[PDB]
Ligand binder design. Structure first.
Ligand code: HEM
Ligand code: HEM
Ligand SMILES: [Cl-]
Ligand SMILES: [Cl-]
Ligand SMILES: [Cl-]
Lengths: 300, 302
C-alpha cells in the first residue's frame, strides 16, 4: 500500500474548490465510482436528457443506436465521460474528445434542427453535475460536501463554455451548484409532450443496464434499482412504471450500505478507475480512448 | 406471459410430504432462489471446511494442484455435479451416474494417498452441504430451513450417503436427522486439526477464485469481507484467512439478509430452476454443462 487507508476525504479538504475544481471532481466521480455505478448514472441520465420529444425521436427513431446497439452506445458515451472526468476541461485530452462530440452533435442538428438548444446542453450537463448528489440523497446518504458542490459547479461551468449548441457555445451557465439543482428541477417540472419515442428509448436504455449487470433472473432486481432512482416525473413521462414500495426501500438501503462500505469502512483505492482500467490486459470498453477531433474552441 | 403465481415455492413445499418428496423439497430449497453466484459462494466456503484434515489440503493443494493452478475449472467442474444432484436427487439415474464418476475419481486418489477419504469425511462434507444454506442464513440473521426443508435435507443427504464411496465402504451409517447432521458438523469443526501450510495455500487459492469471478479488481476487499464474515472462526484460523472487519461484517451480513429477503419475500418467485434457465441460454453456462458420468455400480435402494 502506497497511501493511507483513508486519504480521499482529507485530500479534498486540503484543496481549494475554486482552483482545484478538476481534481476535486475527479476525486468525487472516478475513485469510488466503478463501471457499474457509471453505467447506472448513464442509464438514469439518457431518459432525463431526452424529455424533449425531438431528443427521443433523434436517438430512438432517427439514429436508432440506443435501440439497436445499446451496449455500444453506453460504452461509447462513457469513454468520453471518464476522459472528461479524469482530466477536466482545461486539459487538451478532454477538450479533443469534446470537440468530437461537438462535431457529432453538429451533424445531427443538420439532420433535425431544434434538437440541440443551449437549454438542453445546460440541462444535460447540470444533470450530470448533480447526478451522484441526487442519487445519494435518494438512497438516504449525505449530499456532496461544500467543496465537492463548488468544484462540480466550476467543472461543469467550464465544460459548458466549450460545449456547442444550436444557440452557440454555452456562455451563460447556472451560477452555482444550487442554481444547477434548480435548473434541473425546473426543467423536470416542465410540461413536456409525452411521446411513444420516449417510452421506446427509455425501455431500450433500461434494458442495456439490465443486460449488462442484472442478466437472466436478476433482471427484476435491476429494474427495482432503476425505478427506485429514476425521478417520478421521468418514469411517468416515459411509461417506465413504478417500483414496488417494499423493494424500493430495500434496494435503496442496499445501495446506501454498499456506498457506506466502500467510502467509510474499506480502504480507499490508491488509483482512479480509469487508471486501474489501463493496467488491465484487455482494455475495459468504458475506458478505451475516446475518438478525438481538432480543438476549435479552446478553454479560456 | 407469467405461467405461475408470483409466490408458489413456499406453498409447493407446504403441500409436499418431506419423507417421500424430499428430493423435490431440496430442489425447491437449493436451486430456484440460488444462482451461480450463491452456489459459488457455498463451494468457496465449503472446500476449506472439507479439507480441515491435513491429507485433504495436501491432496488438493500439493498432489493434484487443480484448485491452486486451475481454480476456476475446479469450481465449475465441482458445481456441474452439485447442480445435477440437487436438481434430480439420489433416486435418479442422472445424478447416480454423475456420483459414480466422482466415486471413481476419489477411488484413484485414495490409492495415491490412503487415509484421505474416510467415511468420517464423506459424512462431514455431505452434512456440511446439507446444512450450508441453513448456517449461512442464520449467520445473516435470517430464519433457518423450515420444518419440511430440514427433514427433506436430511433424507436427501442420507440417500446420497448410501451410494457415496469411502475408504471404509459405502456410507451406510449416516447421521439420523438434520439436527444430527448439524451436531456432527459442529463436533468435527471443534476437533484439534493439525495446522499445515497446505491448508493456508489451498484456502487462499479457493478464496481467490471467488474474488476473481465475482469481486474483480477494486471489489476484492468487499468480496473478502463477505467470505470472512461467513467462514467459521475455526476454519479461518486453521487456514490463516484472517478475520473480518467487525463494521464491514455487520454491513455485508445485512446486505445478504436483505438480498435474500428481496428475492424470497418480495420479488416474484422464478418460474424455472436455475439449471433449467441455464439450459435455455444460447451458450451453456459452465456450471450447468452436464457433468461427466460413469457406469452405475452401486445403485440407490433407499
Ligand atoms: C440534449 C440533447 C442531446 C441529444 C439529442 C444528443 C444525442 C446524441 C446522439 C444522437 C449521439 C450519437 C449516438 C447516437 O446515435 O445515439 C450523441 C453522441 C454523444 N453525446 Fe449527445 N446528445 C445531446 C446532448 C449531449 C450532452 C449535453 C452531452 C454531454 C454533456 C452529450 C454527450 C454525448 C457523447 C459523449 C456522445 C458520443 C456517444 C457515441 O459516440 O455514441 N450529449 N448524442
Ligand atoms: C473428504 C475429502 C475429499 C477430498 C480430499 C476430495 C478431493 C477431490 C479431488 C482431488 C478431486 C479431483 C479434482 C482435483 O484435483 O482437485 C475431487 C473431485 C470431486 N469431488 Fe471430491 N474430495 C473429497 C470429498 C468430497 C465429497 C464428500 C464430495 C461431495 C459430497 C466431493 C465432490 C467432488 C466432485 C463433484 C468432484 C469432481 C470435481 C472435478 O472433477 O474437478 N468430494 N475431489
Ligand atoms: Cl466535485
Ligand atoms: Cl438465470
Ligand atoms: Cl478496478
Amino acid at each position: 500500500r502506497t497511501k493511507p487507508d483513508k486519504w480521499i476525504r482529507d485530500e479534498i479538504e486540503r484543496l481549494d474548490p475554486h482552483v482545484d475544481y478538476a481534481r476535486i471532481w475527479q476525486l468525487t466521480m472516478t475513485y469510488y465510482v466503478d463501471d457499474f455505478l457509471m453505467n447506472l448514472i448513464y442509464t438514469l441520465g439518457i431518459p432525463a436528457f431526452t424529455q424533449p420529444p425531438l431528443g427521443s425521436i433523434m436517438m430512438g427513431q432517427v439514429t436508432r443506436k440506443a435501440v439497436d446497439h445499446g451496449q455500444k452506445r453506453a460504452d461509447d458515451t462513457l469513454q468520453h465521460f471518464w476522459r472528461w472526468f479524469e482530466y477536466g476541461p482545461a486539459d487538451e485530452r478532454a477538450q479533443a474528445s469534446l470537440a468530437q462530440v461537438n462535431k457529432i452533435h453538429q451533424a445531427l442538428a443538420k439532420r433535425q434542427p431544434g434538437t440541440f438548444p443551449a437549454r438542453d446542453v445546460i440541462y444535460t450537463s447540470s444533470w450530470i453535475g448533480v447526478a451522484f448528489h441526487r442519487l445519494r440523497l435518494a438512497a438516504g446518504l449525505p449530499g456532496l460536501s461544500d467543496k465537492q458542490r463548488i468544484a462540480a459547479h466550476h467543472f461543469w461551468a467550464g465544460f459548458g463554455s466549450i460545449f456547442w449548441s444550436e444557440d452557440g457555445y454555452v456562455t451563460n451557465y447556472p451560477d452555482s451548484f444550487e442554481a444547477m439543482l434548480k435548473f434541473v428541477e425546473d426543467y423536470e417540472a416542465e410540461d413536456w409532450e409525452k411521446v411513444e419515442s420516449g417510452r421506446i428509448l427509455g425501455q431500450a436504455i433500461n434494458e442495456q443496464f439490465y443486460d449488462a449487470y442484472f442478466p437472466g433472473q436478476l433482471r427484476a432486481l435491476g429494474e427495482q434499482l432503476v425505478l427506485s432512482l429514476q425521478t417520478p416525473g421521468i418514469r411517468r413521462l416515459m411509461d417506465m412504471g413504478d417500483p414496488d414500495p417494499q423493494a424500493q426501500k430495500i434496494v435503496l438501503m442496499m445501495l446506501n450500505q454498499y456506498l457506506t462500505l466502500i467510502e467509510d469502512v474499506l480502504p480507499d483505492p490508491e488509483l482512479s478507475r480509469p487508471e486501474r482500467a489501463r493496467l488491465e490486459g484487455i482494455r475495459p470498453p468504458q475506458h478505451i480512448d475516446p475518438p478525438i477531433a481538432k480543438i476549435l474552441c479552446p478553454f479560456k
